[PDB]
From Swiss-Prot, chains A, B, C:
This is 60 kDa heat shock protein, mitochondrial. Transmembrane segments: none annotated. The modification N6-succinyllysine is found at K7, K58, K101, K109, K167, K178, K181, K194, K212, K226, K277, K328, K372, K457. It is found in: Mitochondrion matrix. It is an enzyme of class 5 (isomerase). ATP binds at K51, D87, G88, T89, T90, T91, G416, D496. The modification Phosphoserine is found at S43, S46, S386, S464. The gene is HSPD1. Keywords: Acetylation, ATP-binding, Chaperone, Disease variant, Hereditary spastic paraplegia, Host-virus interaction, Isomerase, Isopeptide bond, Leukodystrophy, Mitochondrion, Neurodegeneration, Nucleotide-binding, Phosphoprotein, Transit peptide, Ubl conjugation.
């Protein structure tokens, strides 16, 4: 029922391309080892300084709504890449801008932009197949350090710290980053618990900068079954309001109504509560719940044998933890002191249950519980002289951690944008079905040179010349833009995770090729 | 030294196309037998009503300068066609708009608009060759009446009057149009003299609607040689100021200084004077000069034998005429009374000199003098109840006269836009040198259907369907848009002059293909 | 006494670079065989369409005065190149923009821009020496046709016509361009006179579009000595005002006061007069004076023997010509009908005087008078369907004539911007005296790739890639941007005049490096 402005065709496409260009320019100045930082004004306090593509992308909104549409779509590209890999958002942004520009250029009366999108998707699938074919698994801790160093703007100490943490707690251990008060970075191993379930509702979030649910010294509520009555959760609320700890509850499903009462209690000032779902579904659920009960210290309500009721909640029957971190994906409970004698007894029980029988699937769960109570959660404490440098370095360490985890998940390819460059001959072996698919394949093939061009351009040299010298060289040679020479990139350690490259390409292509198909733009009149 | 606005590329091209579209729409509503009229506001008096393409074109100027640039270029198309043929300006306008639109559409990064212009010119030359190949000479007075009827919006009486005038004074006789006070049109022949020389300077023009130098009952001044002295033209000026009658002078070359004094005398209020150059260069010049001297009545100054001086100018030694019409191309004198006995004696002298000897080139000049004294100038007087109706009908009669003269000059082709339609297969036999020439040939081939489409669209039917039914028919069949059926156009008399068709195509192509090659538009900032 | 705005340093330099960039962008779109045209609005009539760099340059003035300063300086570059060579203004503009950009970039606190300008001059002198060392003379008419074809946007017929004219009247004959009424171009030689002297004062110009003094059928006044009295020029003025013909006077020096009276007579409406100076200084002056005296038909006033006075001026004692074109540099006296028997007698006198004695300097003057009266002035008549097309084609023909004349004057180098590219290794052999001279040499060496880059960029390909492939190829190989491949440029006829290249480089460098030295800009406040 609001009055709208309707634009058609090429002027609308150019207006969207203007917003795409502004956002991608501001993001693209941060690309590579010679990229620079962006200062973003914050309303509440000090401005933030970042070299992160998705942060710069999400911080820019435009007054002109036709430009803001393209800006929001490239924000979607950057945010989708950050969600799926945690790295490669600047690459995704420049690839999205390139595909948008080349798609907008090749639009005519007889052109079919939908079949151009089809050819773009076909070419991108071929490139992703070639990326998987040229990928290499990570087999050494030196490769781990190299990936973490490359992903952290060539910070050797950050990569060394990440490599040491992954050596101490395993390549699939839980590592988290928080801000340290001293000047130097440090790594500590403390006993920690993590399961891949988050909050049901995103209404409990307390910090706005971190956008998480962070709690210190919280009571742990356990309900193995469904919560029995309102007269069973209200005494728990009164005990939590009595004994000065907030309530973190672990349960099957708190979705409809008890979650609703917790939301309207959170709406009241000061009262803190958060809910997470069960990790497992079978016997592993009960085993992990008993592990958490022994590691916290208290009792369990909801069992079938002892019939302990939530109605008779008591301070000694609940577990106490140090710090609770709740996110969208996983829940962290940290520094939870229990009965250490009972923790050792449960460890003995687990390692004695190891030597009973083999079934090749239950032993994986029992050993992951063993590593849960055995290998501590690594904590990376980032140091600096002020909050701005700490936040910038924290972004870099988070990038390095995400990239290293993606590297052990999927493998590594050539860095410096050279993997996309070496995937160019794979597109030359495709035969398009019609002319519009040929246009799409050509768009993707011209787009595949953009990240190396941007990395070289940020170093102050001519990017197209560098890219031509890269494709003229052998397949192992690429441009080191830090030293400004042509090197064996694998030997020099300039490598990238395969997951990051393929997800940046896929998200950029998927959004930008759909944006290309537009003919009419409908916006709200600014009132 | 004036501040300018500079625009680049597609937005500038679209802004020019907007002015082209406005002017061509207003012109195109007047096309064909079912076209309508345009009312143009006039500052000095009553608004004018016209069905003439170049009048509507020249009457439109736009406030936006980027639109006004395209409007001025299509005005150039219409005015060039009117100057070269006097007919076919609406056709030239629609062809220019079509070529501008199709050229602006096929402009990309890799496209070369200059070679597209080259291909356009090649295709247009091929079409003009095919038009000449399919043309037919005019051999009958019925074809003359048919051409004059078609060119005057199907006015049978106008075409009959033009055919009767050309029957009485010859197909190459001089016919002029004026407006009569009575309601009926009337044709009459009395006398007349026309030679193809006009005024040297365009500063003597008295009427603004006709844009000509029209004089009633003027003196004839004759200087066979160059004018001797200021003391020879000043007594002529004083005698002209004495005997209540303006001065039309016939001479070799009045260009630099005496013409300048005549201009600054014309700047004074009331004083009327005009100058025209000699018709011939050889003995024909002296023979024609003696012919007007005998036909006007007086004497001649500037001869070698009698040595009559311009200094001793006398009232009885100068000729007197009835009306002088001076244009850019030819000078007209009408109703010039001389000594009719001496006129008959000069006629006897010419017809007796006819039977002396033959040289096949001097006898042509002798016989054209014979037709000068023999075949009088036909005058067409257009009637109506008011000035607006006679002005509209005068435009139609002028169109019909120009088209009939072009028809006897060059021939006739199929009317209704069917000649350009039948020239389409000639373009299919060309092989372009590159892709840009192919684009130009395709632009011209798509443009060749525009006049028949516009004629059919003005009749309220679907133009593209009509054009397809024309090209599916035999080469003699076209659409009569007046009766709304498909007929043998030659038998029904719907025919066109070949000159009109070929000049409309050539001017439209030549300007619009050059306009297509633009990338930057520089305009003045409106101050 | 007018209020001024004063700007310092970097923002002033950026503001000037903005105007430089705007003008150079608009000029640079027209470069090379795939360059496009610029449409310029004209106040009086139809807009003009041009591919000429200096026309686009001079047509752009900006409202912001800091931008308009840089725009006026690059206009100065383009106009100086046009004055010194008549071709290469787009190249001069892009080189000036490049030098201004690279000079503004390397300005710091410790940098000395004056010594950077010194290094720029040293580098440009080295490049010009290398251009002279790599040039070759023109020895064939096919090279003449090739240069004229390249300079006229690849128009084979224009180059063929220029080659035929230079074959018929000699490579140093006088050729001029005028617009023809027919559609096709034509060339004809009849007669003609030219000496390298123009008007003393630029006040008689009546052709506003051509910026020349164009006169038709003018009187020839001759004063071999100084003009005697006011009572000798006043009867000449009265005779000119008597015999309908304007006055072109040939004399020693009409500078102070008789020129002043001619100016105040020209201020009055209609009165036309123009003065030109003597061709020679010695006996050649008298010989040439008698030559146009015989070739015009009349007498001579001012001699020592016959004592003919200017006071007794007579109509039969003055010469009459066909057309007079007066320019800043030379005078065009065309179609002068003298006594052809006396012209033949003077030709016989000259050729019989030629067989008397040898002195190796006077015989050159005798033979140049012989070629003046024997080899006629060629005239090129440019055709088209409208005024805009003939104006664009006239610009191209004038470019081709100027380039061909410069080619026979100085020689030819490689086309396509490859000569400046091949002059790059000459700069690598220089040693700078300090760091600022090194900065200037580097600026010029980076600038030397700009014309080939712009030519390749206008064709829709990547310019830097093309320039690298040119520099890696053999010294004879360059990029044909019309066919889009790499060829022997000399064999394909893509060649340039050495004079055009060296004057474009010198004129760009001299102004742009001085503009680089600026620190403070003082402008007028807009009132
Ligand atoms: N020394 C180097 N030489 C060449 N390329 C390098 C070098 N160091 C890093 N790179 C490349 O830089 C890219 C990473 O750039 P950057 O970290 O600015 O952006 P990103 O990974 O796309 O996104 P995000 O903004 O999330 O960090 C990778 O392609 C990597 O291979
Ligand atoms: N009865 C008819 N049926 C079909 N076509 C017709 C008929 N009468 C005229 N025509 C066509 O109409 C066209 C002439 O239209 P019109 O007189 O409006 O414009 P024009 O000749 O292009 O320009 P101008 O404005 O100078 O008259 C010609 O192509 C002619 O063949
Ligand atoms: N087919 C071609 N291939 C490559 N280069 C070409 C070709 N034709 C012309 N050129 C180059 O184009 C340049 C001339 O371009 P252009 O005529 O637009 O500019 P200009 O001579 O600098 O200036 P202007 O003509 O505007 O006074 C020359 O360097 C010439 O060698
Ligand atoms: K980045
Ligand atoms: K019409
Ligand atoms: K040019
Ligand atoms: Mg990164
Ligand atoms: Mg008509
Ligand atoms: Mg040129």
């Amino acid at each position: 029922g609001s009055a709208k402005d309707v634009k058609f065709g090429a002027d609308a496409r150019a207006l969207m391309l203007q917003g795409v260009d502004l956002l991608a320019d501001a993001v693209a100045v941060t690309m590579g080892p010679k990229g620079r930082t962006v200062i973003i004004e914050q309303s509440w306090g000090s401005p933030k300084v970042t070299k992160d593509g998705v942060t710069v992308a999400k911080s820019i909104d435009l007054k002109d709504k036709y430009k803001n549409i393209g800006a929001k779509l490239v924000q979607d590209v950057a945010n989708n890449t950050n969600e799926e890999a945690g790295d490669g958002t600047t690459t995704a942004t420049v690839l999205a801008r390139s595909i948008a520009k080349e798609g907008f250029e090749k639009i005519s009366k007889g052109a079919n932009p939908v079949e151009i999108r089809r050819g773009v998707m076909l070419a991108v699938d071929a490139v992703i197949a070639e990326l998987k074919k040229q990928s290499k698994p990570v087999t050494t801790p030196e490769e781990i350090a190299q990936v973490a160093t490359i992903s952290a703007n060539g910070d050797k100490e950050i990569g060394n710290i990440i490599s040491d943490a992954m050596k101490k707690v395993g390549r699939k251990g839980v590592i988290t980053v928080k801000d340290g008060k001293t000047l130097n970075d440090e790594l500590e191993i403390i006993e920690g618990m993590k399961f891949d379930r988050g909050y049901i509702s995103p209404y409990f979030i307390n910090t706005s900068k971190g956008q998480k649910c962070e709690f210190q010294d919280a009571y742990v509520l356990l309900s193995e079954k469904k919560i029995s009555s309102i007269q069973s959760i209200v005494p728990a609320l009164e005990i939590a309001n009595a004994h000065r700890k907030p309530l973190v509850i672990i349960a099957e499903d708190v979705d409809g109504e008890a979650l609703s009462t917790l939301v309207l209690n959170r709406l009241k000032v000061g009262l803190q509560v958060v809910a997470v779902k069960a990790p497992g579904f079978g016997d592993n659920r009960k085993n992990q719940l008993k592990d958490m009960a022994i590691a916290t210290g208290g009792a369990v309500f909801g069992e079938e044998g002892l019939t302990l009721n939530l109605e008779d909640v008591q301070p000694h029957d609940l577990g106490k933890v140090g710090e609770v971190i709740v996110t969208k994906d996983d829940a962290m409970l940290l520094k939870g002191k229990g009965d250490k004698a009972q923790i050792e007894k449960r460890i003995q029980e687990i390692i004695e249950q190891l030597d009973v029988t083999t079934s090749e699937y239950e032993k994986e769960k029992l050993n992951e519980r063993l590593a849960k109570l055995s290998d501590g959660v690594a904590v990376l404490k980032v140091g600096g002289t002020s909050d701005v440098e700490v936040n910038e370095k924290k972004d870099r360490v988070t990038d390095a951690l995400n990239a290293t985890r993606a590297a052990v998940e999927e493998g590594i390819v050539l860095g410096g944008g050279c993997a996309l460059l070496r995937c160019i001959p794979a597109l030359d072996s495709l035969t398009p079905a019609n002319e519009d698919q040929k246009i799409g394949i050509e768009i993707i093939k011209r787009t595949l040179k953009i990240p190396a061009m941007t990395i070289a351009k940020n170093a102050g040299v001519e990017g197209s010349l560098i890219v031509e010298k890269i494709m003229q060289s052998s397949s192992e040679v690429g441009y080191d833009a830090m030293a400004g020479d042509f090197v064996n990139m694998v030997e020099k350690g300039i490598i990238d995770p395969t997951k990051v490259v393929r997800t940046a390409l896929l998200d950029a292509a998927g959004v930008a090729s759909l944006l290309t198909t537009a003919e009419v733009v409908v916006t709200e009149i600014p009132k």
